[PDB]
Design a protein around this ligand. Structure first.
Ligand SMILES: CCCCCCCCCCC(=O)OC[C@H]1O[C@H](O[C@@H]2[C@H](O)[C@@H](O)[C@H](O)[C@@H](O[C@H]3O[C@H](CO[C@H]4O[C@H](CO[C@H]5O[C@H](CO)[C@@H](O)[C@H](O)[C@@H]5O[C@H]5O[C@H](CO)[C@@H](O)[C@H](O)[C@@H]5O)[C@@H](O)[C@H](O)[C@@H]4O)[C@@H](O)[C@H](O)[C@@H]3O)[C@@H]2OP(=O)(O)OC[C@@H](COC(=O)CCCCCCCC[C@H](C)CC)OC(=O)CCCCCCCCCC)[C@@H](O)[C@@H](O)[C@@H]1O
Ligand SMILES: CCCCCCCCCCC(=O)OC[C@H]1O[C@H](O[C@@H]2[C@H](O)[C@@H](O)[C@H](O)[C@@H](O[C@H]3O[C@H](CO[C@H]4O[C@H](CO[C@H]5O[C@H](CO)[C@@H](O)[C@H](O)[C@@H]5O[C@H]5O[C@H](CO)[C@@H](O)[C@H](O)[C@@H]5O)[C@@H](O)[C@H](O)[C@@H]4O)[C@@H](O)[C@H](O)[C@@H]3O)[C@@H]2OP(=O)(O)OC[C@@H](COC(=O)CCCCCCCC[C@H](C)CC)OC(=O)CCCCCCCCCC)[C@@H](O)[C@@H](O)[C@@H]1O
Ligand SMILES: CCCCCCCCCCCCCCCC(=O)O[C@H](COC(=O)CCCCCCC[C@@H](C)CCCCCCCCC)COP(=O)(O)O[C@H]1[C@H](O)[C@H](O)[C@H](O)[C@@H](O)[C@@H]1O
Ligand SMILES: CCCCCCCCCCCCCCCC(=O)O[C@H](COC(=O)CCCCCCC[C@@H](C)CCCCCCCCC)COP(=O)(O)O[C@H]1[C@H](O)[C@H](O)[C@H](O)[C@@H](O)[C@@H]1O
Ligand SMILES: CCCCCCCCCCCCCCCCCC(=O)OC[C@H](COP(=O)(O)OCCN)OC(=O)CCCCCCCCCCCCCCCCC
Ligand SMILES: CCCCCCCCCCCCCCCCCC(=O)OC[C@H](COP(=O)(O)OCCN)OC(=O)CCCCCCCCCCCCCCCCC
Ligand SMILES: CCCCCCCCCCCCCCCCCC(=O)OC[C@H](CO)OC(=O)CCCCCCCCCCCCCCCCC
Ligand code: HEM
Ligand code: HEM
Ligand SMILES: CCCCCCCCCCCCO[C@@H]1O[C@H](CO)[C@@H](O[C@H]2O[C@H](CO)[C@@H](O)[C@H](O)[C@H]2O)[C@H](O)[C@H]1O
Ligand code: FES
Ligand code: FES
Lengths: 534, 402, 402, 54
């Protein structure tokens, strides 16, 4: 076939035969955690493309028009050109509503996917040496992704977006030397300003996407260069990777998971409404709603402003407003996240070149601090959303603010305590299995009447008839007998009937032969590791 | 090592695959076919399972194209027939779009699961500190380039060139000073119904012994359409959004947001000219950032227990008080006037201002009382601003005294 | 090969540089210091030559910062004092900015020229067809993956999956059909002074037995400012850009561009109301793409030798002819009426239309005559369009007959 | 005037000219969505492609 001619013509010119061989043969581990990041990547792809489709219709201008579009309930209402063009996307373009909702849902999925991916990186310990650079890059990404998404939903100039813009401007003006100067620099004047929405539009469609794309490219390139970490397991060492090659069996799975995420987004974009701007009306600074919170990924920085106890300083001709302290708090919160691996180094007392991951149970301090930060962030989030929470679940609004205040101290401590003790209990169960074997659950009575539970050893048994303890290795310990194969089906066939018996027996024989062959190869690989380590 | 072509011509394809994997330090320590048996029914079952999702994806995508093209998609009001189709247009097309892509993904996942072999590929790492040769000669080359170039002996050239470098950076950065603006300039106009830009001013500043400024209520009037042989066009020539108000229009325990309405831009009442287009300026006054004020009429029983602020003694006009609607924390409109507790509430971060204790905060992030507007009735019986705010309204900034 | 650390610890730095270069197949076949002599004056000369441009760049960049910050930069009219500074602001700052960066570049060029050694580095290439092993095992791996995966035996799965792939592409592409619009819809309005969107219509289509449409001349009126205690704002309530015209306003051999002016949007003459804002619609009629027409008054001597087009016999009104101003080639305004040669000329690509031979082209890319507008005086003595264009004006499109 | 020339050249193509024009400009020339489509094409799309290709 002419495919060989194409390949020949390519390689005779570019000599890629050595390199692409090395690329296709790279090995990637197959844990389920290790494609959370791919979700964020796929969401970013969708964010790009749907965004580019929205720009052929959106007009980022704060100057007014008397609306005369397809949405009849606002004919004659004087509105910003931004809001009018967003409405024309929603109503006058075939399927523009579908697209706009997909863009928004993709933004939410993108941010939460980054959050969960970062949680995996934090708990499993993958940020450690040499990979802390990917942490410093990645934290910047999850900051900018929020910064972008915020100004992304600020653009339509509806009533719910402009209040968040008002909040941002009023926070900037309050800074204790340069606030007025920084505000006049950013907005080009007092708020609302003529040049405001175009600066934010270009910041949203060109600048921050360009930076995110560059940083994501560098991130993935670094992950590819220094190969992926892995969990401890049979035959795994600090100096090797066990998994599947990037093709055929991994690239197709990446394509398939891309398809799944893509289609999931296209479903939820048509089936759930998001940001129904047409019933919010255009922005004017005199109007506000009871539930006027920012997007979900910004609710934490709303909740901070809700829980600060109004401490304000007056110094003669000057004043530090009460909102400077939430800026300090949120900055400290961001600094701690940004610089984490080094404050981990200074107290952990090690600088080793780790390539194997820690199970979160085996590192109770870090996982306890992670759950502590999770409850802190969640209390900030729900305090941001407490207006809705109190309205729906009928808890007094003052009680919600005080729950946020006192909880941001107390609840983290309770989280740390419970998380630490639970982790210790988990690893105690692991040791109990490794030194006594699995508890099958089969209870038998001896002739003496003693009730005994037969335990099924994993390692060899002493001549007294009891297991010899194994050393814990960091790999997961099986805790039941269905996880050793002992509940697998003996019958073969589909629904409504069996396979013929000859096929049945031969298939089961081949299955068991493979099951012992893979055990043998992993066992020999582990023994080779022992020999090669001395 | 260094394989000749003869041996490669004598080498089998699976052996060549082994050689290719081994050349990159990857060993396929396990690889087994999914269906070894020839007449195995399980292969038929797997083929059926994959083809089911494939045909589901085919019909899903065809249904998407049909729904996108043919399904009614234009807007329908509440009372219109065919509202059902319009309110299912986006949901139906998205449902089937997602079904198409999701089922194609499911089909590919099942194909890789049931058909492609299992694999355990092991690859060695080459990371950590570099080999001692490369990392010692890379410092040799760099030092050699730095010293065969004689920069390190020449201090004056280096200093002047560093000066030139910082100068180049600074001049590349000074056009970035086009954005820098002085916040305290009056933006080159006498004064507007939105002030002069600076944070010290608002619309009500026009009452600084210059202009008569009524308290204008918002009628929320839209533009009005007019159509004839020339075509449909919208007109604001006969309407006015802001309107004056007499003191008998509020009842006790009532609220209304009022805006500054200079006497020049009033087209209501006995003066109503049907062909005077004042809508643009009135709307330009509504949209001022810092000029919406809550006018509150209290009960007599509650007006007894008011505490006046030092210097704001005579601002009220009987039952009527007039506070600024802009919150003193971050500047959201406060706007939640509890009629019995007499607490003005801000929905953004739950500040509570006691309307009876001169608008002093009682809960939430706010630290400072709402400024108060003096008001009085005019010669004709409408309500007017009897003065300017004595205190800078809005959020606090660094140079704001107190 | 495979150097131990002991030898590298015994190896000299220049030898290490040689080893590093050789490890990448690059040989420094020549490298000589620029100034071997110790007390050489040439080194002093080179240092002076570099430092001269460096100080020039320093003063250039300082001059840029000074000019950017302190030089007057705001607009000055023709009669204003200080016009010189404003008209030298950008030139002065750019002059010195370019001097700064250019002199820094010159300094670096001279430094590399006079100080850094000369070099002749030779490097071998590794390109062209790949070595026979790599390129034979890379086809082994690919074929092995393709055949251990069993796609090539399964035709039905491949066909259905290719169907699903094209279906996924098509549904990812159908929202791109939001942009697709039918060019021949009337854009949902009765009719405007700009037509109904379609290329078959213009403003003058309103004369299709519906509306009286005058030939409106452009007075080029700006909006008028008005300032008082409320502030300066611009008004168009008392002005009108389009104005009617009597037949005695042109002289012989004269031209004027006229636009469709429906009777409803006229605010001139005896009907002039100082408080009727018609400016927006009139300007909305001026900016119609295809409704500017050249009204030409000829000399009597030249009106004798006119050739009328079949069907356009009675369109003129005496000396007055009225052609469409939009060129029939690509639609630039023609607008260059030669008063003696009587050739209407288009500046874009030099089409020439004979105004006497019913506007037929005589030179240039144009192939088709300018359409003609029938005109007649009204009851009051102004000029009106007596009909609609019988021919689609503007550039030709695929479905335009002739 | 150059924009006018481009639109008038697009509309003259011998099957799809009117359709391609209405696609590109969103309607007849000048159109409301014209300058924003060209703005985003100028600041985002073609710079992105030029940067990638370079
Ligand atoms: C440690 C040392 C630093 C350090 O301490 O900070 C220096 C800071 O300096 C700049 O502020 C100074 C000063 O500190 C401010 O308090 C002051 O407020 C600024 O003047 C504005 O208010 C004045 C009025 O203020 C007084 O009244 C306020 C209430 O106002 C009302 O009442 C007044 C009665 O009294 C009326 O008069 C007034 O009209 C107004 O009345 C209206 O409102 C009422 C209520 O609504 C109504 O009832 C009324 O009827 C009526 O309607 C009180 O609240 C205040 O407390 C105060 O007492 C006005 O008079 C002015 O006209 C103007 O508006 C003043 O500015 P200035 O002249 O620039 O300063 C001098 C000098 C300093 O350098 C600057 O300029 C600053 C920039 C330097 C730093 C920027 C850094 C760069 C930024 C970014 C990094 C990005 C680039 O100048 C120069 O360039 C010097 C050039 C040489 C050096 C170069 C550098 C600010 O910019 C700050 O950012 C800055 O840090
Ligand atoms: C080889 C075969 C192909 C092939 O041959 O081409 C097919 C082409 O078909 C489409 O054109 C057809 C036709 O060919 C055009 O000549 C016709 O012009 C189109 O109708 C418009 O003009 C009609 C009038 O025209 C006549 O009059 C013109 C002068 O007009 C004035 O005088 C008339 C008197 O007679 C008046 O009546 C009229 O009002 C107007 O008067 C005003 O102006 C005067 C001067 O100013 C004043 O004095 C007056 O007083 C007054 O003011 C002459 O110049 C003309 O020659 C002609 O004789 C009007 O009646 C209509 O209303 C409308 O305006 C007609 O359109 P249709 O109905 O769509 O076609 C049927 C069918 C075809 O598929 C389409 O639709 C087309 C799209 C298919 C291809 C697109 C590809 C996709 C695009 C891109 C790739 C991107 C996606 O429909 C359907 O959807 C069928 C659906 C099923 C199949 C699906 C597909 C065009 O779109 C072309 O692109 C297209 O290639
Ligand atoms: C490093 C390079 C830093 C260069 C920063 C120059 C920063 C600078 O020049 O700042 C003016 C005030 O500088 C001064 O006093 C001169 C000294 C500056 C130090 C602001 O007063 P303003 O009056 O608002 O002037 C506006 C312009 O700045 C702005 O560009 C221009 O576009 C206008 O907006 C103009 O109004
Ligand atoms: C591959 C996927 C191709 C999908 C192309 C669909 C192309 C398509 O549907 O084309 C309409 C006409 O289709 C038909 O006759 C249906 C058959 C199409 C083949 C145009 O008539 P119009 O009336 O201007 O409709 C405008 C919408 O098209 C446009 O989206 C919408 O936003 C409006 O602008 C609407 O006015
Ligand atoms: C069958 C006829 C021959 C075609 C063939 O073998 O593929 C072409 C080539 C290998 O061909 P070969 O025989 O080596 O060619 C002459 C040697 N120079 O093959 C190549 O070099 C092309 C690349 C091979 C890899 C193809 C894709 C990977 C395997 C498929 C997994 C993906 C499918 C996922 C699921 C699909 C739907 C669910
Ligand atoms: C002088 C004191 C020591 C500094 C020095 O040698 O540079 C640092 C390092 C080499 O230092 P070394 O002595 O090798 O360090 C200990 C070995 N591990 O050097 C490096 O590794 C740093 C990189 C070296 C290359 C420096 C720049 C190239 C040469 C300068 C040309 C560019 C200047 C162009 C003209 C300037 C203005 C006109
Ligand atoms: C991180 C947040 C620091 C808030 C500091 C507030 C100081 C202040 O504006 O304090 C001023 C305020 C009076 O002080 C108080 O309320 C006293 C308590 C201040 C906080 C103590 C912890
Ligand atoms: C849009 C943003 C991001 C994208 C697209 C992304 C993508 C990826 C992908 C695909 C992987 C490999 C597969 C996997 O680990 O699941 C990965 C690994 C990694 N990510 Fe991210 N990530 C993002 C954000 C972050 C964040 C927020 C952090 C941490 C603060 C981070 C730190 C890391 C590190 C350190 C690795 C390598 C860990 C290892 O090798 O085991 N990344 N990233
Ligand atoms: C090529 C990059 C992008 C482009 C061109 C783009 C374009 C746009 C445009 C024009 C809008 C406003 C128009 C509308 O409301 O439909 C918008 C809104 C929005 N953008 Fe983007 N965007 C891009 C990337 C992103 C990213 C990376 C995120 C998230 C981190 C994001 C999140 C949002 C959100 C949440 C909205 C509000 C949607 C709505 O209110 O309907 N966008 N985008
Ligand atoms: C994946 C991306 C593209 C990769 C490009 C690198 C691989 C290039 C493969 O190049 C291809 O190798 C096979 C190896 O047998 C050669 O195949 C040829 O081999 C010998 C010559 O050596 C011929 O007698 C034989 O008939 C023919 O199969 C092709 O002539 C060559 O075109
Ligand atoms: S804006 Fe009012 S409490 Fe914050
Ligand atoms: S536009 Fe008139 S000659 Fe081309």
């Amino acid at each position: 076939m002419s495919l060989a001619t194409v390949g020949n013509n390519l390689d005779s010119r570019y000599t890629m035969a050595s390199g692409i061989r090395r690329q296709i043969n790279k090995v990637f581990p197959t844990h389920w955690s290790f494609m959370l990041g791919e979700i964020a990547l796929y969401s970013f792809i969708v964010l790009l493309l749907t965004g580019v489709y929205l720009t052929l219709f959106f007009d980022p201008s704060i100057t007014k028009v008397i609306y005369d579009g397809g949405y009849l309930p606002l004919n004659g209402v004087e509105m910003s050109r931004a809001y009018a063009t967003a409405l024309d996307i929603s109503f006058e373009v075939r399927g523009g509503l579908f697209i706009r909702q997909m863009h928004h849902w993709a933004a939410l999925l993108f941010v939460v996917s980054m959050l969960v991916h970062m949680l995996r990186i934090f708990f499993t310990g993958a940020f450690r040496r040499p990979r802390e650079a990917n942490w410093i890059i990645g934290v910047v990404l999850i900051i900018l992704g929020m910064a972008e998404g915020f100004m992304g939903y600020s653009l339509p100039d509806d009533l719910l977006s402009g209040v968040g813009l008002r909040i941002m401007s009023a926070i900037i003006v309050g800074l204790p030397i340069i606030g007025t100067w920084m505000h006049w620099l950013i907005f080009g004047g007092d708020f609302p300003s003529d040049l405001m929405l175009d600066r934010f539009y270009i910041a949203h469609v060109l600048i921050i996407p360009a930076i995110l794309l560059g940083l994501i490219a560098a991130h993935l390139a670094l992950v590819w260069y220094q190969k992926h970490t892995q969990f401890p397991g049979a035959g795994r060492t600090e100096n090797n990777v066990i998994g599947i090659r990037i093709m055929p069996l991994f690239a197709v799975k990446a394509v398939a998971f891309g398809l799944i995420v893509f289609g999931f987004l296209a479903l939820l974009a048509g089936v759930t409404t998001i940001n129904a701007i047409w019933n919010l009306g255009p922005y004017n600074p005199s109007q506000v709603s009871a539930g006027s919170q920012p997007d979900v990924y910004m609710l934490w920085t709303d909740g901070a402003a809700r829980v600060m106890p109004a401490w304000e300083l007056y110094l003669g001709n000057y004043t530090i407003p009460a909102v400077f302290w939430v800026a300090v708090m949120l900055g400290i919160l961001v600094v701690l996240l940004v610089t984490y691996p080094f404050i981990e180094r200074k107290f952990t007392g090690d600088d080793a070149h780790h390539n194997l991951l820690q199970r979160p149970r085996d590192v109770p301090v870090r996982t306890s601090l992670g759950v502590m930060a999770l409850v802190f962030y969640i209390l900030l989030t729900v305090s941001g959303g407490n207006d809705v929470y109190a309205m729906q679940f009928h808890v007094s609004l003052n009680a919600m603010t005080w729950i946020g205040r006192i909880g941001l101290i107390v609840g983290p401590a309770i989280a740390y305590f419970i998380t630490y003790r639970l982790c210790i209990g988990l690893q105690r169960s692991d040791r109990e299995v490794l030194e006594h074997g699995i508890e099958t659950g089969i209870i038998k009575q001896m002739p003496n009447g003693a009730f005994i539970e037969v335990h099924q050893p994993l390692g060899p048994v002493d001549d007294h008839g009891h297991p010899i303890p194994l050393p814990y290795a960091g790999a997961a310990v099986p805790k039941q007998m269905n996880q050793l194969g002992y509940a697998e089906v003996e019958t073969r066939g589909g629904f409504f009937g069996p396979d013929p018996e000859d096929i049945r027996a031969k298939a089961k024989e081949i299955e068991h032969a493979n099951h012992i062959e893979e055990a043998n190869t992993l066992r020999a690989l582990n023994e080779a590791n022992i020999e090669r380590d001395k | 090592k260094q394989y000749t072509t003869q041996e490669l011509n004598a080498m089998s394809n699976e052996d060549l695959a082994r050689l290719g994997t081994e050349l990159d330090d990857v060993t396929i320590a396990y690889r087994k076919e999914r269906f070894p048996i020839a007449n195995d029914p399980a292969e038929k079952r797997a083929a059926r399972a994959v083809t089911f999702w494939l045909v589901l994806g085919i019909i899903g995508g065809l249904g998407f194209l049909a729904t996108y093209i043919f399904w009614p998609w234009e807007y329908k009001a509440h009372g219109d027939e065919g509202l059902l189709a319009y309110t299912l247009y986006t949901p139906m097309l998205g449902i089937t779009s997602g079904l198409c892509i999701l089922s194609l993904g499911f089909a590919v996942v099942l194909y890789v699961k049931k058909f492609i072999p299992e694999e355990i590929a092991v690859q060695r790492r080459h990371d950590g500190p570099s080999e001692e040769v490369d990392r010692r000669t890379i410092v040799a080359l760099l030092n050699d380039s730095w010293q065969t170039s004689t920069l390190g002996r020449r201090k004056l050239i280096m200093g002047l060139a560093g000066g030139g470098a910082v100068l180049a950076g600074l001049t590349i950065i000074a056009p970035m000073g086009g954005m820098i603006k002085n916040p305290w300039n009056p933006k080159e106009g006498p004064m507007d119904v939105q002030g002069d830009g600076t944070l010290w001013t608002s619309g009500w500043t026009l009452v600084e012994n210059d202009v008569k400024v009524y308290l204008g209520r918002d009628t929320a009037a839209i533009a009005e359409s007019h159509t004839d042989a020339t075509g449909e066009h919208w007109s604001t020539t006969g309407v006015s959004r802001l309107v004056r108000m007499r003191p008998e229009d509020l009842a006790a325990a009532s609220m209304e947001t009022v805006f500054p309405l200079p006497a020049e831009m009033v087209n209501d009442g006995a003066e109503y000219d049907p062909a005077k287009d004042v809508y643009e300026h009135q709307m330009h006054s509504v949209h001022g950032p810092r000029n919406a004020v809550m006018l509150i009429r209290l009960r007599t029983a509650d007006a007894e227990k008011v505490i006046e602020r030092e210097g704001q003694e005579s601002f009220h006009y009987g039952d009527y008080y007039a506070y600024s609607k802009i919150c003193t924390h971050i500047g959201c409109p406060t706007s939640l006037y509890e009629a019995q507790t007499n607490r003005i509430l801000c929905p953004c971060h739950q500040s509570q201002f006691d309307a009876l204790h001169y608008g002093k905060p009682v809960f939430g992030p706010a630290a400072r009382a709402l400024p108060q507007l003096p008001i009085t009735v005019d010669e004709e019986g409408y309500l007017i601003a009897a003065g300017n705010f004595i205190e800078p309204l809005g959020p606090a900034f660094w140079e704001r005294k107190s």
